[PDB]
Amino acid sequence: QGSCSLEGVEIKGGSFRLLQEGQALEYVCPSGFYPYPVQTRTCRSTGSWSTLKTKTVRKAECRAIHCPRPHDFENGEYWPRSPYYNVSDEISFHCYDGYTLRGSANRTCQVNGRWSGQTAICDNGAGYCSNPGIPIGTRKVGSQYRLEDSVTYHCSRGLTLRGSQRRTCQEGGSWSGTEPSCQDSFMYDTPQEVAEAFLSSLTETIKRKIVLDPSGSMNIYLVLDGSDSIGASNFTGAKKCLVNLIEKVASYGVKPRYGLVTYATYPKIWVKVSEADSSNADWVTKQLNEINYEGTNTKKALQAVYSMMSWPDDVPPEGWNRTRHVIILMTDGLHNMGGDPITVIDEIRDLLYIGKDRKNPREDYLDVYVFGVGPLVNQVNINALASKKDNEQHVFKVKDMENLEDVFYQMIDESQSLSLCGMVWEHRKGTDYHKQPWQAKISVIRPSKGHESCMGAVVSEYFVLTAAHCFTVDDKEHSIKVSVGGEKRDLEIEVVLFHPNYNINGKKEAGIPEFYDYDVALIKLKNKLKYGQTIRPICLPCTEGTTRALRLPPTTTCQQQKEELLPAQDIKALFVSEEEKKLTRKEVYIKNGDKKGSCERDAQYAPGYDKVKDISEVVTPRFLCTGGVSPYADPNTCRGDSGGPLIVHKRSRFIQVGVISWGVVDVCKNQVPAHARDFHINLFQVLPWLKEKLQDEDLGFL
């Protein structure tokens, strides 16, 4: 219908995007922050947008994220106790007299409003089933853990419960349903989390494996809500996703029968599990790559799945009780009109003979996974559709279709190698250096002057990339100590090669103290590096490894890699920072579009630069600029973050595009000025040197 004017819809320190024909809008803020008071707004019929109530507010703002307080913790205590916790605030758990603790007892408020680790439970064994525990932010009603007992979970006001709200102690000793959690509106899952939590609970760990039965089979049904952003560009993103899913599931030595359904308003059936080619993975793939478009009705799609399931006669077919069914539904709307689709799930469970016994519940033979995309997804319907299994997650909510692509990219990249550059698998028990294995700390003990602390990047097995200003010719090799993988041991250096065009002595008699042009250095290690879960390389620009990371054809030029990694935009980069012996990922933006000159202009607030006539004499084409308060409140770099890699996170891989070189003001361990920018060396501009010096490291430079 009619549209609204955007007069004043902007948000303090954030951006917005118009969904659904401009009739709705979502607010997006920076990492750690959430848009306040509401994330979304629609266009009214009165011309204006939705009001922002919390008490009308005129404009919106981005405000820091808090992690919830444990409503209660049975049979033990936790501390520090507080009503809310800021980001990166740790809490520890202990239990009472004679109880045993399970789960992570040193949790930490992550940047996403969730606590690190898993739910702490203090149990003894005084019940048939185990103590189901209280996930942080919930409230459990019930404390008797005998057979056939129930426990109910409640979420605070304004929060949506994902998981089971009622778990019964089943025959066994395992609980029913899945552990619940409370979800805010802005809360999204990261493609790493989705990939890991889907792979696990699709498979079992012996590498993983898919557990079918003797003379058993698997039917996989892919349902796609192609009435919105999912079915755009002829299902291109969803096509990539499902191709990689089919490949990854085929890599497990199983040949499942596939069914493929799209639905905008009516269900369109492309592949049916009855076709003899329904198990031919590449026939299914070729049929998928040719789906096309063309009110959202989901019940019809689930009924098409049910018709696939149902049999041609009263007498059963052979092997009905040995087939395992998987229903992967991808949607971005799901306001369940046209009917209530839960009844279809109940009819399905009736047909599979699930939940009709006590010794044969058969819950292993039906898995339902739901991938919601965008803010307009109904967190309640998707959770009602999906399944609930102990220690398993089946509901996911991601931000764009791009993140949904990155999910399956990450899934495909899982079991390739340890030499795969820029690969990090977010695990369940991951430490700091598990998540930044390329990181390398350089320490230089300078006489009479501050101990220089720099960072680095492991670009190959013998080399480490850093910034040249960390070193000097006075510094002997017995004062430079490099450490990778977070280990005490310092490494043995062969030679530190500086760029041939580097000189910090300027431009000295011209009135400029520091000249950081071509501020890159390569440390050649004497020994070799042993790649592992803690040491791994990072991708470099204009190498075939980065082309394979960007999912591009081998006939791609270095310029194409440039315009894919560094376009004329506000590219979202990141780096890693030392914070009390901890490695934190700080997320910044590279002003390379229309704000580039505004970034470079703020270099006159820098020491010794306040009287330079031409600012292009100190900020050369070899520099990328981050920082500032536009379009977002970028975090700044530390004195010790110097030399570290400036990373771009694309297609679930990490590509280094810059080396942290200098900053306008040094205020890091922190009101902060808006001219506080940081400048990094563009690795695309020092490429001949890198190619010449790393020609024998098997990087396959373009």
Partner DNA sequence: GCTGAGAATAGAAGTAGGAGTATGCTTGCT
- State the catalytic residues: 469, 519, 642
Would the annotation count 181 as a binding residue? Answer: no
Closest separation between CB of residue 383 and DNA, Å? 11
String of DSSP letters for 82-117: -S-B-TT-EEEEEE-TT-EEES-SEEEB-TTSSBSS
Stretch that binds DNA, among 33-41, 128-136, 392-400, 487-495 (CB under 7 A): 33-41
Q: By CB under 7 A, name the one of 380, 384, 444, 493 that touches DNA.
A: 380
The nearer residue to DNA, 55 or 488, going by C-beta atoms, is 55
The nearer residue to DNA, 187 or 625, going by C-beta atoms, is 187
Q: Which of 79, 143, 85, 77 is nearest to 110 (CA)?
A: 85
Q: Which of 663, 406, 660, 431 is nearest to 549 (CA)?
A: 406
Closest separation between CB of residue 546 and DNA, Å? 38
Residue 15, CB-side half-sphere exposure with 13 Å CA sphere: 10
- Tokens encoding 337: 């009109």
Closest separation between CB of residue 399 and DNA, Å? 14
Using CB under 7 A as the binding rule, whether residue 378 contacts DNA is answered as: yes
Q: By CB under 7 A, name the one of 13, 16, 33, 39 that touches DNA.
A: 39
Q: Which helix (H) or strand (E) holds 691?
A: helix 687-693
Residues numbered 310 to 349 that lie near DNA (CB under 7 A) are: 333, 335
Stretch that binds DNA, among 41-49, 286-294, 511-519, 654-662 (CB under 7 A): 41-49
Q: What is the rounded CA–CA span in Å between residue 385 and residue 292?
A: 26
Using CB under 7 A as the binding rule, whether residue 44 contacts DNA is answered as: yes
Are 438 and 653 in contact, with CB atoms under 8 Å apart?
Answer: no
The nearer residue to DNA, 47 or 172, going by C-beta atoms, is 47
The nearer residue to DNA, 27 or 365, going by C-beta atoms, is 27
Would the annotation count 443 as a binding residue? Answer: no
Closest separation between CB of residue 261 and DNA, Å? 22
Q: What is the rounded CA–CA span in Å between residue 489 and residue 534?
A: 14
Using CB under 7 A as the binding rule, whether residue 104 contacts DNA is answered as: no
* Residue-wise burial string across 42-67, b where 16 or more C-beta atoms lie within 10 A, e elsewhere: ebeeeeebeebeeeeeeebbbeebbb
Q: What is the rounded CA–CA span in Å between residue 643 and residue 139?
A: 47
Residues numbered 191 to 220 that lie near DNA (CB under 7 A) are: none
Stretch that binds DNA, among 69-77, 373-381, 638-646, 665-673 (CB under 7 A): 373-381
Closest separation between CB of residue 26 and DNA, Å? 8
663: three-class secondary structure by DSSP:
strand
Those residues whose C-beta lies under 8 Å from the C-beta of residue 252, and which sit 6 or more positions away, are 203, 208, 209, 210
Q: By CB under 7 A, name the one of 91, 370, 377, 525 that touches DNA.
A: 377
Q: By CB under 7 A, name the one of 3, 5, 22, 42 that touches DNA.
A: 42
Q: Order of strands across the sheet with 653-663?
A: 582-589, 572-579, 645-650, 653-663, 677-682, 623-627
Backbone angle region of 24, left / alpha / beta, with phi > 0 → left and psi within -120 to 50 → alpha: beta
Size of the site for DNA (CB under 7 A): 24
Would the annotation count 419 as a binding residue? Answer: no
Stretch that binds DNA, among 378-386, 396-404, 506-514, 543-551 (CB under 7 A): 378-386
Closest separation between CB of residue 156 and DNA, Å? 10
Residues numbered 45 to 74 that lie near DNA (CB under 7 A) are: 45-46, 48, 50-53
Using CB under 7 A as the binding rule, whether residue 397 contacts DNA is answered as: no
The nearer residue to DNA, 376 or 672, going by C-beta atoms, is 376
Q: By CB under 7 A, name the one of 41, 388, 650, 651 that touches DNA.
A: 41
The pairing of strands 33-36 and 582-589 is unpaired
The nearer residue to DNA, 377 or 566, going by C-beta atoms, is 377
Closest separation between CB of residue 228 and DNA, Å? 10
In this structure, what is the dihedral angle of CA atoms 342, 344, 347, 349, given to the nearest 10 degrees? -70
| Backbone angles phi and psi of 538, in degrees to 5 | -115, 150
- Tokens encoding 658: 């810059």
The nearer residue to DNA, 218 or 382, going by C-beta atoms, is 382
- Could you tell me the maximum CA-CA distance found in the chain, to the nearest angstrom? 96
Closest separation between CB of residue 404 and DNA, Å? 18
Beta strands in 545-609 (DSSP E): 572-579, 582-589
The nearer residue to DNA, 181 or 244, going by C-beta atoms, is 181
Q: What is the rounded CA–CA span in Å between residue 19 and residue 17?
A: 6
Site map (CB under 7 A) of DNA, residues 132-171, x = contact: -------------------------xx-x-----------
Are 684 and 676 in contact, with CB atoms under 8 Å apart?
Answer: no
- Tokens encoding 248: 């990854």
Stretch that binds DNA, among 236-244, 352-360, 371-379, 670-678 (CB under 7 A): 371-379
Using CB under 7 A as the binding rule, whether residue 185 contacts DNA is answered as: yes
Rounded (to 5) percent helix, strand, coil in the chain: 20, 30, 55
Closest separation between CB of residue 137 and DNA, Å? 14
Are 345 and 366 in contact, with CB atoms under 8 Å apart?
Answer: no
The pairing of strands 572-579 and 582-589 is antiparallel
Residue set of the binding site for Mg(2+): 227, 229, 296
Residue set of the binding site for Mn(2+): 227, 229, 296
Residue set of the binding site: 227, 229, 296
Give residues in contact with DNA (CB under 7 A). 38-42, 44-46, 48, 50-53, 157-158, 160, 185, 333, 335, 376-380
